[PDB]
Amino acid sequence: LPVSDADPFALDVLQDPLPFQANLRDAGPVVYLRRYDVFALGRYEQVHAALTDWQSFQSAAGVGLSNFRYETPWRPPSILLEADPPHHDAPRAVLSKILGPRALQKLRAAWIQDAEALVDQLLANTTEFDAVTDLAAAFPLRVFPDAVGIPDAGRENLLPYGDHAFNAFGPANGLVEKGAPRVAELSGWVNAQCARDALTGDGFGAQIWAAADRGDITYEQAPLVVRSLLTAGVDTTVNGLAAVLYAFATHPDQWARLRENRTLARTAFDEAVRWESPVQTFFRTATRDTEIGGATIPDGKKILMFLGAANRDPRRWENPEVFDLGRNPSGHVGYGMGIHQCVGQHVARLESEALLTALASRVHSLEIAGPVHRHLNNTLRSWESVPVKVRLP
Ligand code: HEM
Ligand SMILES: COc1ccc(C(=O)O)cc1
């Protein structure tokens, strides 16, 4: 069995994980990380197998490093992300209906419009700006908390709350331990936005509580289902949006292709999600001795699935390092796969469709205007700054 002292949460790897990914894939289907006592998977075949096989690889012992068999969770674990069937089934089906295609139809014209207002206002002021702060961060914060229906107070908690959650899936290293004094306040705030009386009458929050009225979920589940939205719903889309913007800023032919066919927006965003893989890793825990990639994972031990690695595995993807909207990215594991696969993907895509359409409407060409800067995180590939210069027609 290949065994390694590689630390996937070291600051150098988080800054640039592409060499670790390629070594993981090259070493074997399964690599034992001695540092953490887990089994790493980097190739698509095994990452796909592990994601779908919920019977062998459970989530309820936690999908971070931390094993809830023994360790105290930093918060009450997610009743979606960290629940197996049957407990998973009810809250899943509620979000699945609420965030599904049909349901989102009603928000499309609003979100297109908000995107056009954000872009018009930005462009009236500057032709050069940061795509992170001015676009990728700014647009989800305009539309998404409003669609959930939380109030305006404490909205500055959304990004740190998400950040901390994604960090907290990794080891108790400095990125988690620096977050840990501010947890109580961060948690205090989020719980407070999940109550029925904190939410507007019509948003996703409202609809979650309406599902509880019908007995789809309990009144005890209702706030934690809202909480999933406020953990997973913001940071991921910001980083997905910074990735596709960075890609278009770096790929003038691909930008022209979008401008020729605006219906390419959905597939543009999915290709960014494959190529960037905003969520890089998750854990599962083996329920039995299970054989994957030629290796036996003992009952009770954790696997580490490298989504980013699988999404650039050349066994599944031709020339994987390339961002190409010509590629069919369908089958990427950037949203996961099987019963836990991202229930917010219709939201992500509509966001990208709105923003991309607004941008392409006004912007002849786009380039990188300055150094790019990452924001380090144990689990989430985060962008801090993407300076861009746009040329108006
Ligand atoms: C680009 C954006 C996004 C990425 C890259 C992403 C990624 C993921 C991945 C990889 C999973 C699978 C978890 C696992 O298998 O253990 C997932 C699940 C989930 N995502 Fe997303 N996500 C994104 C956007 C969103 C949005 C906008 C929401 C808001 C609705 C959301 C809510 C969730 C929830 C609740 C789950 C857990 C579902 C379950 O366990 O059944 N995500 N996401
Ligand atoms: C993909 O990341 C997440 C993170 C948190 C949750 C949750 O809190 O429900 C779901 C998905």
Author numbering: 8 to 400
Please give the exact wording used by the authors of the publication that reports this structure:
PbdA had the highest affinity (Kd = 3.8 ± 0.6 μM) and apparent specificity (kcat/KM = 20,000 ± 3000 M-1 s-1) for p-MBA. PbdA bound p-MBA, veratrate, and isovanillate with the highest affinity for p-MBA. Moreover, the binding of p-MBA resulted in a near 100% transition of the heme iron to the high-spin form. The structure of the three complexes are very similar to each other (RMSD of 0.176–0.683 Å of αC) as well as to the other CYP199As (e.g., RMSD of PbdA·p-MBA with CYP199A4·p-MBA and CYP199A2·p-MBA is 0.989 Å and 0.883 Å, respectively). Substrate orientation is maintained by four hydrogen bonds to the carboxylate, one from ordered water and three from active site residues Arg84, Ser87, and Ser237. The ordered water is localized by hydrogen bonding by heteroatoms in Arg236 and Ser237 side chains. The aromatic ring of the substrate is stabilized by hydrophobic interactions with Leu90 and Ala241. Residues Phe173, Phe176, Phe291, Ala241, Thr245, and Val288 form a hydrophobic pocket for the aromatic ligand. The high affinity and specificity of PbdA for p-MBA is consistent with what has been reported for two members of CYP199A subfamily, A2, and A4, (18).
